[PDB]
Amino acid sequence: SMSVKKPKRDDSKDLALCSMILTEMETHEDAWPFLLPVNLKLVPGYKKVIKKPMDFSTIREKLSSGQYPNLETFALDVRLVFDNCETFNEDDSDIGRAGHNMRKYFEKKWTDTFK
Numbered sequence: 001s002m003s004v005k006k007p008k009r010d011d012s013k014d015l016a017l018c019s020m021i022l023t024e025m026e027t028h029e030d031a032w033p034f035l036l037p038v039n040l041k042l043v044p045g046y047k048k049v050i051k052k053p054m055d056f057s058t059i060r061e062k063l064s065s066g067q068y069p070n071l072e073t074f075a076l077d078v079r080l081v082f083d084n085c086e087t088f089n090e091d092d093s094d095i096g097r098a099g100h101n102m103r104k105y106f107e108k109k110w111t112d113t114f115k
Contacts, residue, residue: 014071018063021109025078026056028105030098034081050088054080071114078106 025031037055040047059077068074085099 011071015063017113018068018071018074021106021113022056022060022063022078024109025102025106026060028102030101031056033085033095033098034102046088050084052080052084054084056081075110079103082106 026035034056036057038046038050038053040053046053054077059074059081062068062077063074068077082099082103085095089096089099091097091100
């Protein structure tokens, strides 16, 4: 509250560490469905159904230009990528399985780096 603060958690390396995580997600072999924005002209149904499209390239641009206020807003966009994928893709598809694998990979790196 006013003039009463919990001790200051060191957040000065967060930008660098989120960049490293995002590099590791970019270079995973199952990243291919997520590298670029879904082409809304060429994929029927995507525009209407997926209210907030997100992809790794869009995250990389937001990260590089100071559009994440803190590490939690960064994790929300990564998870959005996987939540979108589960909304549109069957679990038993190459893209569906890719999304499950990537989410697992992300969540481990996140815990190991920050928790």
